[PDB]
Design a protein around this ligand. Sequence first.
Ligand SMILES: CCC(=O)OCC(O)(O)CCO[C@@H]1O[C@H](CO)[C@@H](O)[C@H](O)[C@H]1O
Ligand SMILES: *[C@@H]1O[C@H](CO)[C@@H](O)[C@H](O)[C@H]1NC(C)=O
Length: 400
Amino acid sequence: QTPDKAKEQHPKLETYRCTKASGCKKQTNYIVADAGIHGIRQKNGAGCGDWGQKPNATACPDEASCAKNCILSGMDSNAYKNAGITTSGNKLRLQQLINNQLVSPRVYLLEENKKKYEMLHLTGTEFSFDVEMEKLPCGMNGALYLSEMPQDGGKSTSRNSKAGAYYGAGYCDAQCYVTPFINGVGNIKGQGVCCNELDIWEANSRATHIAPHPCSKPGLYGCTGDECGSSGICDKAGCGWNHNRINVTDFYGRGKQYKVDSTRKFTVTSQFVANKQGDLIELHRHYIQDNKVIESAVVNISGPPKINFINDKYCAATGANEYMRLGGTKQMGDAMSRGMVLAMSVWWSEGDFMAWLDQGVAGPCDATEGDPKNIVKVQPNPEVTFSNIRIGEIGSTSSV
Ligand SMILES: CCC(=O)OCC(O)(O)CCO[C@@H]1O[C@H](CO)[C@@H](O)[C@H](O)[C@H]1O
Ligand SMILES: *[C@@H]1O[C@H](CO)[C@@H](O)[C@H](O)[C@H]1NC(C)=O
């Protein structure tokens, strides 16, 4: 699409860079809503296409026409607020609903100059963040993850591509979903929009999940036919880590009965260990709450290696067959080393109700409480706050 001339006012977010030698130094970053949350429209008000499909055929018969007819609207600070997105010092608040309107934001982290996504190179390094989960019931997903999005939002791939990173274009993930726009241009051939994805955090107050999703094509790839499916170029399922699934059901939850109490603030630390050739070999996690380090628990079922972190062996032993076929942890690390965009979002699901996150072997939610119509009766205004984001050397981003 073509951005209009309204003033874009990206919420400021302070983040930190850390070294064992000198501590953590503050720096200024900016937050951007997804291109589609800005509002993409024809001049008569019709949309330029729904999620899951090619762009409207009459506004977008080809790429040049799509860019002419599909206008993206600038977002001022009120627009951000009404989109459920606000910041304060090092905090980012994401709200699911504003005045009974579903807003379910998804945002990206911008460098200080605002023209580029702050690309993160996490293989060999550590990432820490604090989070407040109290207001997310069964069926919700408050998410922190990375995707291998183009830093410029797709601008250099086409003279028709105008939005860039300034307007939040170029989103991709390992689900290879068909979106109306791709690389800031109309998705004329209806290709699935793919890229390597690192799900650091996917959660509600009842269950948490971690999942690397490697893909066999580097950067953002437009898939067709069998490329987009279950035997395709991307690992849809991911290689998952959920305490409930490895039978440690008292690790994470609401209240004093859990080692990590989801009703009060806590720190999440992720360490991406590499070997001497610079390949990622394992993903670790620990927590800090009330000033005390809390270690992740060992696998408590038979089969998988008795460890508390992710590696290829664990993934093969827990059935992550597409993950191993597509290159496994190494392939994940290769995308992490090239650089990836940080994304933060809040959402729910009308189909499966997020059952894979928090039902049956994944957690304590029944079959229907996580339906959006029941979610709002447990918590009228589901929201999540991510803050204090610190990146850098292993051992330097958090501590007691
Ligand atoms: C490699 C990273 C990867 O695949 O990450 C992506 C995900 O795992 O979070 C998959 C879900 O993403 C969520 O999908 C729904 C549509 O289903 C959106 O409305 C939310 O904004 C979005 O964050
Ligand atoms: C596609 O755009 C055309 C033209 O403006 C409009 O007539 C049509 O109704 C649109 N389709 C949808 C589903 O909005």
